[PDB]
Amino acid sequence: KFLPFQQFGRDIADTTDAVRDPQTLEILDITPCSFGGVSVITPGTNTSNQVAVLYQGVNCTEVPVTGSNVFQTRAGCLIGAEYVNNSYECDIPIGAGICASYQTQSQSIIAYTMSLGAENSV
């Protein structure tokens, strides 16, 4: 709710956050266009030429399009790896507890939540 004389909002770092539309006076949020890094997850080229791609910190309703597997992790969107419900020791760390590895499925890149070890009641 801008005061009647105020035209554009601005943030802590003095970046324009909102505007008032001049024709019709409503307040419009401005959000930066989605960006991020792109990581390539591979087993060695000595094992396979298969690849998975991670778009870091990006919801992938905005990714323009490895494999058709598309998974949403807290690190970003993962393409070319399927999320299984097992847990193993971390092979390739993706982030937020998610790892990836090359496994029989015949072989493909899978994503999973890493196991911390085997339970043991003394």
Partner: protein, 294 residues
């Protein structure tokens, strides 16, 4: 999401860190220090506390005889920890310092984008539009070198701050190995007092060690002697110190007052009563004679 700067999520989630801390606590409580050196061997918890009392030089009968009092003192101390952290607004100030330095560096980096850097304007579109290609090119190069230097400064400060964080994490790992996975004999490592146990607790970007230590409490003055002369022989305590309450002589353990009759069982003989400076005259009981004669 601002100006090409990104924050990556840590690999281990806070739930995973808490699972680690729970495994460490369960191992300590159910098996002592054994799970850190091999397989976890179970032991009753009071027996573990008796081992810890042995490790600081106090006999385990002291633990077994004061078990309920020791348990009560421990429970009160843990409750007081909870209360103390609920209060004293800046007790977690080291974690906050790390967070704040991180945030200040980033906000400074963003605010350096607006500085003219000696150029006509801080906006690339404006410099592009309002000047011819060559002059605008020179102005934009001034902006570029300014921003590049600012970014280089930020990265160098991050390297220095990460070196300090690595020193702190190395110390924390040493304390997890030596205070939580063992009982430490190093002084003031693992808190002030004689270390008994430590418990880890996970904190945002950090760890909290609760150190359980033994503190001697109510002192008494006694007279002491280095050796005792009996039959022209000098006797020294095998483990303990000779004390006197004014009339009678006992041998006690050095960290807890528990007087006992001076016997050939708790002393050893060496030499005669001539060389030791301060040797006193007393009798050393021999259990064998009365139980042999009777």
């Amino acid at each position: 999401k601002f100006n090409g700067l990104t924050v990556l999520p840590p690999l281990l989630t806070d739930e995973m860190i808490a699972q680690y801390t729970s495994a460490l606590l369960a191992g300590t409580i159910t098996s002592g220090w054994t799970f850190g050196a091999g397989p976890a061997l179970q032991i009753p918890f009071p027996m573990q506390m008796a081992y810890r009392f042995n490790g600081i030089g106090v006999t385990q009968n002291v633990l077994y005889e004061n078990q309920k009092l020791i348990a009560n003192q421990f429970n009160s101390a843990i409750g007081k920890i909870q209360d103390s952290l609920s209060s004293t607004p800046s007790a977690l100030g080291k974690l906050q310092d790390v967070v704040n330095h991180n945030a200040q560096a980033l906000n400074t980096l963003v605010k350096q984008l607006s500085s003219k850097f000696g150029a006509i304007s801080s906006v690339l579109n404006d410099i592009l539009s309002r000047l011819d290609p060559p002059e605008a090119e020179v102005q934009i190069d001034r902006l570029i070198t300014g921003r590049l230097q600012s970014l280089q400064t930020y990265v160098t400060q991050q390297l220095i701050r990460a070196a300090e964080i690595r020193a702190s994490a190395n110390l924390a790992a040493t304390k997890m190995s030596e205070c939580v996975l063992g009982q430490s004999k190093r002084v003031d490592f693992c808190g002030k007092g004689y270390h008994l146990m430590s418990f880890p607790q996970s904190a945002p970007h950090g760890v909290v060690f609760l150190h359980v230590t033994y503190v001697p409490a109510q002192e008494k003055n006694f007279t002491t002697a280095p050796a005792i002369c009996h039959d022209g022989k000098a006797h020294f305590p095998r483990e303990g110190v000779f004390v006197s309450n004014g009339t009678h002589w006992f041998v006690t353990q050095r960290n807890f007052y528990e007087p006992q009759i001076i016997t050939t069982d708790n002393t050893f003989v060496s030499g005669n009563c001539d060389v030791v400076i301060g040797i006193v005259n007393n009798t050393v009981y021999d259990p064998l004679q009365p139980e042999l004669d009777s």
